[PDB]
From a paper:
Thymic stromal lymphopoietin (TSLP), is an interleukin-2 (IL-2) family cytokine produced in response to pathogenic stimuli by skin keratinocytes and epithelial cells in the lung and gut. It regulates immunity at barrier surfaces by driving the activation of immature dendritic cells (DCs), mast cells, basophils, eosinophils and lymphocytes into a type 2 polarizing phenotype34. Consistent with annotations of human TSLP as a member of the IL-2 family of cytokines, its mature sequence (residues 29–159) adopts a four-helix bundle with ‘up-up-down-down' topology stabilized by three disulfide bridges (Cys34-Cys110, Cys69-Cys75 and Cys90-Cys137), in which the four α-helices—designated αA, αB, αC, αD—are threaded via a BC loop and two long overhand AB and CD loop regions, with the latter largely invisible in the electron density maps.
We were able to biochemically reconstitute and crystallize the TSLPΔ127–131:AMG-157Fab complex and to determine its crystal structure to 2.3 Å resolution. The structure reveals that the complementarity determining regions (CDRs) of the variable heavy chain domain (VH) of AMG-157 target TSLP at the AB-loop region and C-terminal region of helix D, while the variable light chain fragment does not interact with TSLP at all. The TSLP:AMG-157 interface buries a total of 1,200 Å2 of accessible surface area, with all three VH-CDR loops contributing to a polar footprint. Furthermore, structural superposition of TSLP in its two complexes shows that the AB-loop and C-terminal tail extending from αD adopt different conformations, with the rest of the TSLP main chain being very similar (r.m.s.d. of 0.56 Å for 89 aligned Cα atoms). Perhaps the most intriguing feature of TSLP as bound to AMG-157 concerns an ordered water molecule that inserts into the π-helical turn of helix αA in TSLP to provide a hydrogen-bonded bridge between the main-chain carbonyl and amide groups of Tyr43 and Lys49.
Numbering used by the authors:
A (entry chain C): 4 to 140, 147 to 197, 204 to 224
B (entry chain A): 28 to 61, 64 to 114, 133 to 156
C (entry chain B): 4 to 216
């Protein structure tokens, strides 16, 4: 029955503020140290902040100190994280976890919340810029579909070019909040990639050399 | 309301090892605690929690103050703290109590 | 600032024992905890205080801490043990919780496959748009863990790198992309740029030369 349930996550622009909550249940909240841990997409775990069992001491990681504020309510069994002056690098899933304290030592994180997503971005609907991909010196060519939002785009090559293979790689989500992807065709004839981005009502047709 | 900040922790530990522990285990039908819902962060804090769980009634268990281990506990605190002086739901409570004592008994550095 | 170092990847055959190490300065002096994170889920504690197990954890999992090395041992590796594993300590000198980089445990469902790498230089077109992007395309590798590094001539490049998380493709092997953003000036002011893709300790490197484009 021991649980931590989080909320408050969402999408904000850089410089804006956000307030996360964490609700404990099934254990005596006021006897445990409470922490915030975050994980950027595809990255590792990064400790953010801690508040002592009695709310007496508050300690932060340097990457957030002076911008984030951790608080707790032992009568409501609630933990909070007030996030001010958000930057792109704060984009992450934010977990809360409980940990016993002993004197000055913090012990293992035995209970974790389910996590809440926080996105710091100014990204808005935008069609892609398409550039050709050709080697410097079998071989392959393609087109680079750069800086679009939101997903998805569809890339289709002309019927003639598609005889020896084709690979459209998953997109990279950049810190700016924009996407980019690459699509390549195998070659030992014309090569034309048709890019369609419905969310922006953008179509682009480029021939590669 | 009583803070156990000024208690004689070493003496209370000695009392636990010599007496209180045995009465807890016997009450626990000869078992020792290993799922924690209560914790403590220092020796003064542990005794606060031990105080509450041992003597105060909670919604789920009557007061354990009549029990042997509880009377031994009252004795230890009366002496070493200046100014101080079976249901499934109760077994769960006393098991948390063994956990708190274990933390309280932890080695000094 | 204390540092824990793990291998980015460890692979094991089904039924075999997996060993994930965690390195740190005088790590035997600290209590090391281990966490398991399956894709899309919150981390789960599997080992605490070097060698102790929670109730909800199989006896297959076991930990040890000695010298400058902690180790998480998983006996008789099962497919369900596939996850990312993080070691963690509380550093008293710096008063910080420190996580390791994380180790992806892979229970092999197919033979190991080295990545094939393709490196594209900036096109003549985007250079005229006052931008420059090097594109490193990585495919056909298994297990699905890779480390991508960039070099300008012989020195590394940290800024302007954007790399995807490896994704399973239709051929059941993984693919990945890394983008290096440069100014046209930077691109032309070097003899070469390189994409270093490390997989299972082995590296595949591709080079491009601005003067050859």
């Amino acid at each position: 029955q021991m649980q931590l349930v989080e909320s408050g996550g969402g999408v904000v622009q850089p410089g804006r503020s956000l307030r996360l909550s964490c609700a404990a249940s099934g254990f005596t909240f006021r006897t445990y140290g409470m922490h915030w841990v975050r994980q950027a997409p595809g990255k590792g775990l990064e400790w953010v902040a801690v508040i002592w069992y009695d709310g007496s001491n508050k300690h932060y990681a340097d990457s957030v100190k002076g911008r984030f504020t951790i608080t707790r309510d032992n009568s409501k069994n609630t933990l909070n994280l007030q996030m001010n002056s958000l930057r792109a690098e704060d984009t992450a899933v934010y977990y809360c976890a409980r940990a016993p304290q002993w004197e000055l030592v913090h012990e293992a994180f035995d209970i974790w919340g389910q996590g809440t997503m926080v996105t710091v971005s100014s990204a808005s609907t935008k069609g892609p810029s398409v550039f050709p991909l050709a080697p410097c010196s079998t071989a392959a060519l393609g087109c680079l579909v750069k800086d679009y939002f939101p997903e998805p785009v569809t890339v289709s090559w002309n019927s003639g070019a598609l005889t020896s293979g084709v690979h459209t790689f998953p997109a990279v989500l950049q810190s700016s909040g924009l996407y980019s992807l690459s699509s390549v065709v195998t070659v030992p004839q014309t090569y034309t990639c048709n890019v369609d981005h419905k969310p922006s009502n953008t179509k682009v047709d480029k021939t590669v050399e | 309301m009583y803070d156990f900040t000024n208690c004689d922790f070493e003496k209370i530990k000695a009392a636990y090892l010599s007496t209180i522990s045995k009465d807890l285990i016997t009450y626990m039908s000869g078992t020792k605690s290993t799922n924690n819902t209560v914790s403590c962060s220092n020796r003064p804090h542990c005794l606060t929690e031990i105080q509450s769980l041992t003597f105060n009634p909670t919604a789920g268990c009557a007061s354990l103050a009549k029990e042997m281990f509880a009377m031994k506990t009252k004795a230890a605190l009366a002496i070493w703290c200046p100014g101080y002086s079976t249901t499934n739901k109760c077994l769960e409570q006393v098991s948390q109590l063994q956990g708190l004592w274990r933390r309280f008994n932890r080695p000094l550095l | 600032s204390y540092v824990l170092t793990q291998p980015p990847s460890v692979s094991v055959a089904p039924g075999q024992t997996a060993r994930i190490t965690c390195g740190g300065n005088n790590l035997g002096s600290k209590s090391v905890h281990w966490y398991q994170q399956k894709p899309g889920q919150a981390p789960v504690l599997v080992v605490y205080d070097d060698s102790d197990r929670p109730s909800w954890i199989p006896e297959r999992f076991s930990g040890s801490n000695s010298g400058n090395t902690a180790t998480l041992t998983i006996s008789r590796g099962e497919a369900g043990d596939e996850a990312d594993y993080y070691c963690q300590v509380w550093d008293s000198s710096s008063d910080h919780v420190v996580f390791g980089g994380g180790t992806k445990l892979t229970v092999l469902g197919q033979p190991k496959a080295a990545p094939s790498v393709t490196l594209f230089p900036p096109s003549s077109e985007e250079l005229q748009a006052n931008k420059a992007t090097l594109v490193c395309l990585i495919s056909d590798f298994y297990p699905g863990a890779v480390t991508v590094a960039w070099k300008a001539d012989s020195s590394p490049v940290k800024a302007g790198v954007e790399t995807t998380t490896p994704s399973k493709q239709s051929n059941n092997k993984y693919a990945a992309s890394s983008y290096l953003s440069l100014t046209p000036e930077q691109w032309k002011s070097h003899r070469s740029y390189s994409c270093q893709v490390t997989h299972e300790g082995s590296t595949v490197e591709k080079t491009v030369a601005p003067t050859e484009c």
